[PDB]
Design a protein around this ligand. Structure first.
Ligand SMILES: NC(=O)C1=CN([C@@H]2O[C@H](COP(=O)(O)OP(=O)(O)OC[C@H]3O[C@@H](n4cnc5c(N)ncnc54)[C@H](O)[C@@H]3O)[C@@H](O)[C@H]2O)C=CC1
Ligand SMILES: NC(=O)C1=CN([C@@H]2O[C@H](COP(=O)(O)OP(=O)(O)OC[C@H]3O[C@@H](n4cnc5c(N)ncnc54)[C@H](O)[C@@H]3O)[C@@H](O)[C@H]2O)C=CC1
Ligand SMILES: O=C(O)[C@@H](O)CS(=O)(=O)O
Ligand SMILES: O=C(O)[C@@H](O)CS(=O)(=O)O
Ligand SMILES: [Zn+2]
Ligand SMILES: [Zn+2]
Lengths: 436, 436
């Protein structure tokens, strides 16, 4: 008993090829021609001819008129993000353990050296994105943080994005957008400090560029056009459900809004209401959401909660709201989503700006295998070990034998050599020497 | 000043273009043609015309002659890997916290649904790799584990590789190698079970295939041709240092072996001994190690411990052995490596086969941003949140104001709507409505 009351023509997969073609071309050009290729893209794409690296004096000049009340809101949001980041940092521990007697092994948890953070600016200026990356990197104890945001409307970095970067602790700020920003941070163009990890959200081109540069750099997650899903039962309020879908639909023409419900009445009311709310939006938002709802919006009626879980996990939405009775059950049973909003009171926009948990989140089904940007994306979990000579009697003979079973004679000789050195009178079966 | 007593012509970067050209072509063919392309590659690259998925009966038949002693060694190794993996699992906790009053936020730690594991077989048959992936996935509580290894030496999967997969708990086993194996696991070809995460080591083509498919799937880490670095002071034994370098140089022509030392006498003796040890290897190993040492081997003399740390962190070796006095200091000060071997007694081959910590590890500098395969690579760290209505007074007004500063009116309306529903008599500043 599963019925599409609204089916989308397009999905997050639809625009893959378009993004990949552009990114392949631009990365090739930037690899070949470095800073010059980037300055050319900045000019042709973003109308930008000025300096790319902002000086401290420029940062101060460009934020000097940012009012106290704006700064207070941004500062409060930075605190909430920092508070939760520090809680997440405490959840991953170092340890050591004894395995075979005399074998000590452990886990070190160490921050990366350099992070590059992207904050988008195109349709809107992503003030909150600016602190989501930088504040988290600082909470992780990352020593160098480089931050980029696109020149905005043929001017420079939006001043509130700039304030957010500075207030959150960015060490270097560049007026640089899109693929060329992501590439510049990966290769250390302009700063001479190649990033270890590049993070942050953006359009399909930005997200693909990061996906492509994985390997050269670590990343947080594939964080492309915003997605919202709501699970609702008959207790939900259609006006609020509809509002919440429209809230993320304004992000752009490619943003999916998904409703999974056990109530046809709720589905019906929401489908009537969403167009009405969209029609009351201002121009830019109405442009985005009209196309997004039409092309990517879906409404799925389900017979049981179990069916809702199955569909929701398959969709693996960036953001998942749950407006139902018995919220404990939903927290226990849902397994694929970026960020979960339990109950009507919280909502995606709160998470976007100031709840505390990061908003930089998996899209296009990446929630099947990753959560969002967090301190965990900046910590390396490395292993170490140490042995007594006694431990090597067992460990070394097993190693020699398995190595020789595999055909790895030089491996086995490293065990032979220790056995002969440490225990010259011992006689073990170290495996028949490899002859080929 | 840092002196290269042996400089390499080649580095892990040298063969990037070669690997990328092949992988681009094969992944295009498999995307377009599916199983047909995979069957074609299995035949053309690996000489294989047989069925690809093994039945339970084939698994039994192909392992029925594996001797008790071989099974006992493999079983011991699986236990060590499992023991350490369970300890790692305990190191990442779920939690919840109060942020702003009435805001509850938490972290859920959930295993992925399907993992695909690759165990290489080409120059050698990677028995240990077979349990490194599968046993770790099972320790993480992954419910479906798909495992591939290449047809080897005119037969199917090497029988000891197959025993390792079975004993470690693989649900599905495929006789399937290389790029076609990685792609089949990513797309769920032959099983109808697309992986959420694909893991495991291989040659440059395997590693590039995984790196390229990132996004479609999650991965552990870029785990390509094996690397070994040794840090040594004057207390080290050159015979053991040389043996350890040669141990990993046998992996293939592209395996780098690096010595970082403060002792000129040690460097000199190791440089004399390494060729002598290589000359005494059987043919496959001698073929690999001669080329590897010549082309990729490096010996670097440093004045101070601090210089050694700086160079070692820059190289970011998959494996790092430390044959020095004062091992505590090295543990405290080194920061970029895959897996650390403190003291002479343990050694890379032990970690490869049976110490416990995973051997599937970052190469080509990936240790700057990730540790190895571990249970952590199978867990998703997701966030959830829940609010009282009261919490939304602060959270909602900050959200509305910031949203409107960014130009996101629909976002702000979701806050407005809650404020009107929950607190109709409140009169907070919710920001100037966006008009454009
Ligand atoms: N997944 C997540 O956690 C989040 C996702 N987002 C998403 O970020 C996106 C922001 O998109 P935008 O407003 O476009 O800002 P953006 O900053 O991502 O993109 C602007 C940059 O892209 C370049 N660009 C645009 N079209 C291009 C083309 N055809 N070829 C090459 N370069 C091109 C521009 O010249 C500029 O440099 C939205 O879709 C939003 O939903 C926002 C926040 C978080
Ligand atoms: N980073 C790590 O943790 C580890 C790395 N390794 C590395 O794994 C590697 C194993 O390499 P192999 O013996 O080659 O086994 P493999 O299993 O990686 O490769 C064999 C497969 O690759 C295919 N292949 C080989 N050359 C090809 C080409 N030119 N075009 C397309 N397909 C091609 C073969 O047909 C076959 O399917 C070694 O370099 C070893 O050092 C081993 C264990 C762990
Ligand atoms: O997809 C996201 O995380 C966005 O909703 C965040 S923001 O609205 O751009 O702040
Ligand atoms: O790079 C590696 O981890 C290898 O040394 C592991 S094995 O020798 O192939 O087991
Ligand atoms: Zn949003
Ligand atoms: Zn090895």
């Amino acid at each position: 008993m599963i019925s599409y009351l609204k089916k989308a023509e397009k999905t997050p997969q639809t625009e893959t090829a378009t993004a990949q073609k552009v990114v392949t071309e631009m990365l090739a050009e930037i690899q070949a021609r470095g800073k010059d290729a980037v300055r050319q893209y900045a000019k042709q794409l973003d109308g930008w001819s000025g300096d790319i690296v902002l000086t401290p004096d420029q940062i101060r000049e460009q934020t000097k008129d940012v009012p106290a009340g704006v700064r207070a809101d941004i500062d409060f949001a930075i605190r909430q993000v920092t508070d939760f980041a520090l809680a997440q940092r405490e959840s991953l521990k170092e340890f050591s353990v004894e395995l075979h007697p005399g074998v000590t092994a452990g886990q070190r948890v160490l921050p990366v050296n350099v992070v590059g953070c992207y904050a988008p600016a195109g349709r809107y200026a992503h003030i909150a994105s600016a602190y989501m990356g930088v504040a988290t990197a600082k909470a992780a104890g990352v020593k160098t943080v480089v931050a980029c945001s696109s020149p905005f409307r043929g001017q420079g970095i939006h001043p509130h994005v700039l304030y957010a970067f500075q207030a959150a602790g960015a060490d270097v700020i560049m007026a640089l957008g899109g693929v060329q920003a992501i590439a510049s941070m990966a290769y250390g163009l302009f700063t001479g400090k190649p990033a270890d990890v590049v993070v942050g959200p953006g359009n399909k081109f930005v997200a693909e560029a990061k996906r492509s540069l994985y390997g050269q750099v670590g990343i947080d997650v594939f964080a492309g056009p915003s997605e919202v899903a709501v699970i609702a039962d008959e207790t939900a309020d259609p006006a609020i459900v509809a509002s919440d879908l429209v809230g993320q639909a304004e992000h752009g023409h490619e943003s999916p809004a998904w409703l999974f419900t056990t109530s046809r009445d709720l589905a019906d009311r929401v489908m009537a209401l969403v167009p009405e709310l969209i029609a009351k939006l201002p121009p830019t938002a109405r442009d985005a959401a009209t196309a997004a709802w039409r092309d990517y919006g879906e409404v799925i009626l389900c017979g049981t909660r179990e069916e809702v879980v199955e569909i929701s996990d398959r969709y693996a939405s960036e953001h998942l709201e749950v407006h139902t009775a018995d919220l404990d059950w939903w927290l226990a049973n849902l397994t694929c989503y970026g960020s979960l909003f339990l109950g009507e009171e919280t909502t995606v926009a709160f998470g976007d700006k100031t709840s505390g948990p990061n908003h930089v989140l998996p899209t296009k089904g990446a929630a099947r295998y990753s959560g969002g940007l967090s301190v965990h994306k900046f910590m390396k979990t490395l292993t170490w070990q140490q042995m007594t000579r006694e431990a090597t009697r067992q460990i070394g003979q097993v190693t020699a034998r398995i190595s020789r079973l595999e055909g790895m004679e030089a491996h086995a000789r490293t065990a032979d050599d220790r056995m002969a050195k440490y225990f010259p009178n011992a006689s073990f079966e170290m495996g028949t020497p490899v002859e080929v």
